[PDB]
Design an enzyme around this catalytic site. Structure first.
Site, PDB file in Angstrom:
ATOM      1  N   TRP A  42       1.123  -1.003  -0.173  1.00 60.44           N
ATOM      2  CA  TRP A  42       0.068   0.080   0.407  1.00 60.44           C
ATOM      3  C   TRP A  42       0.669   1.260  -0.057  1.00 60.44           C
ATOM      4  CZ3 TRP A  42       0.438  -3.553   4.074  1.00 60.44           C
ATOM      5  CH2 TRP A  42       0.692  -3.341   5.104  1.00 60.44           C
ATOM      6  N   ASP A  43       0.801   1.718   0.996  1.00 61.13           N
ATOM      7  CA  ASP A  43       1.296   3.246   1.270  1.00 61.13           C
ATOM      8  C   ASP A  43       3.111   3.063   0.808  1.00 61.13           C
ATOM      9  OD1 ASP A  43      -0.242   3.940   3.131  1.00 61.13           O
ATOM     10  OD2 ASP A  43       0.896   4.607   4.555  1.00 61.13           O
ATOM     11  N   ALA A 129       4.463   3.768   8.051  1.00 61.60           N
ATOM     12  CA  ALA A 129       4.822   5.025   6.755  1.00 61.60           C
ATOM     13  C   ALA A 129       5.854   5.860   7.529  1.00 61.60           C
ATOM     14  CB  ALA A 129       3.918   4.995   5.840  1.00 61.60           C
ATOM     15  N   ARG A 199       1.904   9.364  12.781  1.00 58.08           N
ATOM     16  CA  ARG A 199       2.709   9.371  12.551  1.00 58.08           C
ATOM     17  C   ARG A 199       2.869  10.071  11.047  1.00 58.08           C
ATOM     18  NH1 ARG A 199      -2.872   7.027  12.178  1.00 58.08           N
ATOM     19  NH2 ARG A 199      -3.744   7.152  10.506  1.00 58.08           N
ATOM     20  N   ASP A 200       3.700   9.051  10.369  1.00 57.38           N
ATOM     21  CA  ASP A 200       4.378   9.722   9.044  1.00 57.38           C
ATOM     22  C   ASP A 200       5.414  10.145   8.404  1.00 57.38           C
ATOM     23  OD1 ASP A 200       2.208   7.438   8.165  1.00 57.38           O
ATOM     24  OD2 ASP A 200       0.804   9.435   7.438  1.00 57.38           O
ATOM     25  N   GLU A 284      -3.218  13.098   6.823  1.00 60.87           N
ATOM     26  CA  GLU A 284      -2.419  11.817   6.373  1.00 60.87           C
ATOM     27  C   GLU A 284      -1.048  12.155   5.348  1.00 60.87           C
ATOM     28  OE1 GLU A 284      -3.620   8.004   7.087  1.00 60.87           O
ATOM     29  OE2 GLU A 284      -5.921   8.804   5.784  1.00 60.87           O
TER      30      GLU A 284
END
Lengths: 412, 410
Positions: A42-43, A129, A199-200, A284
């Site tokens: 995915w990501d 991620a 996150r990220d 995101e």
């Protein structure tokens, strides 16, 4: 360091148009190919430099992916008739997520390279991620990523790439260092909300002051349900749009942190750059393009993370300005940069806008005959967008997973 | 300077369904201000800085005006049926300037014609701006003389008032100021449907000189214009065909005065061009706010080029410098569009610096597949501007045009 955030208001979000052909991603074909019959991906995270440039190494392109196994022959996903519940297997990916890498001479037809880190290296089993940074022409890499459950921390792990005419290896990613977690004054913590988003990481060198910063997804700090949706959050809504329902439960933001020096070993959190209280819970994978003297700050969001009273598509949103600390203005007036088409509203996600204008994303769900849909877990067609001032325009599409190098780095 | 281009790609972002840029619905039972005249384009009395002004406590507006003919055999059939729609469409060739006044900014009292019949060089007197020049009550009326030809013109006169009302007097000598040139703006010889009208004068807040904007068309023989990369813009795949779009050639023009008397003018190149997009960028006018130039212009659904769709209403462009470059408001350019279920309810919007927007009523749907003609003022509505975006707010009564400042005559 203090600055007020840019507010993405409800009035701004009422301008979102899911039917604008200049901001709609092209339709994914129902017969898309799948990169792997054994893993979902995915990501997707292209190898890049701290200035944003997507790089190959010794002529090899390299991407990292969040990865989870497929379980087609597994009794827990098989019903009485032996039908495979792929949708549930796919939804279960997040708890099994690990970082893997792929490589290619051509920017597509990716060859699987395996796990980045040995099992047990990450402090958490989930590896969510972030960004892999090529540091130098010796091939040293810093992988910034998110360790989740228990808790959520932005972390980094140093390793190296080596190549030959036969392929790429990523090696020696063996010690993870946690960098920071949500604090509770600027960004919402687990104790304030067990569904907190944190996150990220996307690290970069600022074009203006040359310091090392990162943006990341956060939520505005405060106990779940305590936030106020007041004038700033509502914006100048027209008559008949005063009701916000339970909008105060949606509290996404784009966060900023700054490194003590260019080694990126010690970080200090800064206040939120862009907030979406009363608008959307999830801003995101935030990331920048620096172009034409402007900061273009992109972020991905979902139709179903919008507050009550608002409607918009899954896809890429963006904010633009002349200064890193803002204020920013919503791209295309509403914020929407590239939305999924309303007839395939969940066809792609986790878009990454690269500085060449190409946008990569992964395939989630594509409608098929019989009011059914098929699961992707593979790369979508890349599409190019052009930026013009505070506006964007979708252009031509490319093959699945096309992620060409902007520059090749030959290792010493 | 190069013009700002409003491209096809910009116009493809126009959203007729955005609640932040939609005019409120006009009621089917609106009142009409006169049962003897139609009015339409409405022009509030203002100063050269844009401020809408009352004089000795009287608000004053000018309107284009034409008689109604409900008992005229030429609009009546054998059965007594009155063709109001034709009478209303015939207004343009009967247009004359009249004025109205009120202590309250509404419930307007008819003041009659500004100029005696025959003063204007042309029978038609089309729109412009009345400027209150000083506290003696001198006024410059800038307006358009049309057929034969089209010239931006002015006529000096004066306002006097009493407790009983207002008079505008002594508008007796028109001076033509300029016409289309044929290198910057299209002329009658290049296009007998050329647009050249609607002067809006102002003193520039930066350099202190007197300028005006006005509606033009980009110069060139009808049919000759090119719709190339700049006019197309970055359209998405499937939107390359422009059909007959080269026949739509609207622009916003600019001129500058020799000095602050505004008696001699020099034309300057077009500010904003819409070749291949829309033939009519009408009644251009500014708001100066927050260090920016907001340049508004009105346009029609039916003057768009092939392959584009947008509503009748107000559009706008914003920037930091008078000579540009400008960017389209709300990304598409649309500021306030008619609602799609009443697409022709209002026109000729005038955005005033207090945010209030006045327009006239054109056509409103009623019981059945039928409709009513307006020729009267619509409800005023307020918009707010935030950077390069706008948001519609509350509505007010029909024809509400309050003063921003009162000028007591000395």
């Amino acid at each position: 360091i203090n600055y007020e955030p840019t507010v993405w208001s409800r009035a701004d979000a009422l301008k979102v148009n899911e039917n604008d052909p200049t901001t709609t991603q092209p339709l994914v074909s129902a017969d898309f190919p799948v990169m792997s019959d054994t893993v979902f991906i995915w990501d997707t995270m292209p190898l890049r430099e701290l200035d944003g440039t997507v790089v190959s190494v010794n002529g090899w392109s390299v991407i990292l992916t969040l990865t989870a196994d497929r379980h087609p022959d597994d009794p827990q996903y098989l019903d009485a008739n032996g039908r495979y519940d792929i949708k549930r297997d796919w939804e279960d990916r997040h708890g099994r997520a690990r970082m893997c890498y792929w490589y290619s001479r051509t920017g597509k037809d990716w060859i699987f390279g395996g796990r980045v880190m040995a099992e047990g290296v990450s402090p958490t089993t989930r590896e969510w991620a972030g960004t892999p940074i090529l540091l130098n022409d010796k091939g040293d890499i810093d992988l910034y990523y998110t360790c989740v459950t228990p808790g959520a921390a932005i972390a980094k792990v140093r390793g190296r790439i080596v190549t030959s005419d036969q392929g790429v290896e990523l090696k020696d990613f063996t010690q993870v260092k946690k960098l920071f977690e949500a604090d509770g004054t600027y960004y919402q913590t687990e104790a304030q909300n067990s569904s907190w988003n944190f996150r990220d990481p996307s690290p970069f060198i600022d074009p203006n002051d040359g310091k090392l910063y990162m943006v990341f997804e956060g939520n505005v700090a405060g106990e779940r349900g305590s936030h106020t949706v007041g004038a700033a959050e509502l914006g100048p809504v027209p008559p008949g749009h005063e009701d916000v329902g339970g909008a105060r439960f949606q509290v996404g933001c784009i966060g900023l942190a700054v490194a003590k020096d260019l080694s990126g070993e010690e970080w200090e959190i800064l206040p939120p750059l862009v907030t979406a209280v009363g608008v959307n819970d999830q801003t995101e994978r935030p990331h920048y393009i620096f172009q034409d003297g402007k900061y273009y700050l992109f972020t991905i969001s979902h139709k179903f993370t919008y507050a009550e009273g608002l409607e918009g598509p899954d896809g890429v949103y963006g904010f633009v300005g002349e200064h890193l600390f803002g204020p920013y203005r919503p791209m295309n007036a509403s914020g929407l940069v590239l939305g999924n088409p309303p007839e395939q509203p969940f066809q792609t996600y986790s878009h990454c806008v690269m500085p060449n204008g190409l946008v990569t994303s992964f395939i989630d769900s594509v409608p098929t005959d019989g009011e059914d849909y098929r699961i992707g877990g593979t790369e979508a067609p890349t599409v190019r967008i052009v930026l013009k001032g505070d506006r964007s325009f979708v252009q031509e599409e490319y093959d699945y997973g096309y992620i060409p190098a902007m520059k090749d780095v030959q290792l010493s």
